[PDB]
Amino acid sequence: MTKWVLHVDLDQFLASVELRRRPDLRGQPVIVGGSGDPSEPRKVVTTASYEAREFGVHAGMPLRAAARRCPDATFLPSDPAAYDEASEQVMGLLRDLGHPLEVWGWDEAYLGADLPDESDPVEVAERIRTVVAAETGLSCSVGISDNKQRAKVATGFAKPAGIYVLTEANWMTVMGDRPPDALWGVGPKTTKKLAAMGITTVADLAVTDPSVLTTAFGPSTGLWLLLLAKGGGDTEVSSEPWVPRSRSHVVTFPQDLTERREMDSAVRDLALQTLAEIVEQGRIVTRVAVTVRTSTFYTRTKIRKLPAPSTDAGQIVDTALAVLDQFELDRPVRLLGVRLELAMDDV
DNA sequence: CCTAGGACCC
DNA sequence: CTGGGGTCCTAGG
Ligand SMILES: Nc1ccn([C@H]2C[C@H](O)[C@@H](COP(=O)(O)NP(=O)(O)OP(=O)(O)O)O2)c(=O)n1
Ligand SMILES: [Mg+2]
């Protein structure tokens, strides 16, 4: 038997869901985000189709910028319920292959497989791609390795509509001259810190003296960085259901708020909304966090623990408005948010 | 034991 | 000009 980890990731997810209702747009630039109006201020791209990506459009880009770069794009509004339904379909199908399946957010999953000699993980990945497309109308790509971190890196090579195997046989030859942010969990700030140590590539990091890393990053994290660079990772695929730690809602206002009354009212509303959604899922609140962003884009969050976990609406609102009260509120307000941290122990 | 917030990801 | 929704860990009262 040979043990594999497969990492499945939906291609251009939100665009691919829209394309199933608009098959005439396959092969054309499609941009999903806001209300489908590319001139609307304070709205951004949530997904650009691969064709729009060749024009430099990417998630986060303001729609008016996207329209400037990609004049021949069809702009569609965001349809969150269709996306949540398509997510559910795909994972339902993936679970029914009879392998341990670990869903990771919305559009991806890790699958564990122990394969007899007669089979090949590439042909299994093929079948996954086939079943998802036949039953859902959606394309996925599949990375293959022997650990989750490496399989995820493989997926980035597998894109679009494809499959890629990355193992001890080829890890360092493919990855060795890549910057450390090619690794999963490393980003630009860790990369900058590494560079000031003389480490500029995956290969450099993989042969770094462990005591250089543990002094700079801590005794666990430094060893973990060395492991990631060597292409190692997590090997167990858990089917245990994911328990969310928190839920949040923010809103960027079409115009900046200048009246306290309105700020209070928005926070009250966001608390109430978030609370009802966590109650409907059976959850209890532990902490209440409020975020404020000024017209200058100066952004801060403050948090306060309840005296005991609760779902009491008046308590939770009073706490959010007391947290909001801590902010200066001297400048116009562009954004307000509430996050509810959730009890993890019993349910 | 608590909050602030950096860093990284979809 | 610059969206929305998350997780984890550390720095420091
Ligand atoms: N900055 C971001 C990144 C992702 N997302 C949403 C929309 C994406 O289609 C979806 C999935 O993330 P993704 O898998 O990183 N990318 P996407 O599926 O569009 O493309 P590929 O995975 O084919 O490259 O999360 C977002 O709303 N804001
Ligand atoms: Mg994807």
Ligand SMILES: [Mg+2]
């Ligand atoms: Mg993804």
